[PDB]
């Protein structure tokens with residue numbers, strides 16, 4: 001399902017904490033508490049083009065593979081050229 005940067009940007013933190021990861025929207029409004037690096041790193045990239053600051057962070061493949069378990073959406077076919 002598509003989502004626009006607007007809705008994404010709203011959903012930073014507290015009960016709606018979404019991330020655009022490799023052109024794929026995951027909500028992670030819970031995992032905030034769970035991540036070994038806690039909220040901060042998620043929060044600061046939430047409602048954002050986290051694609052990059054996610055996979056470039058030296059994440060182990062593991063942290064990527066679970067990523068494709070969730071998927072609430074992809075994105076609008078315009079925002080597709082912002083993530084870059």
Ligand code: HEM
Pocket residue numbers: 019031035036037041042045050053054057059060062063066067
């Ligand atoms: C999809 C859910 C994610 C999972 C399950 C996950 C899992 C992990 C794991 C297992 C590590 C530790 C790697 C190790 O000890 O070798 C890690 C490290 C890290 N993650 Fe994530 N991660 C997720 C999402 C994110 C996101 C979205 C960000 C922010 C953009 C992020 C930022 C970081 C950072 C900064 C570190 C390392 C910091 C340091 O070395 O002190 N993670 N993650």
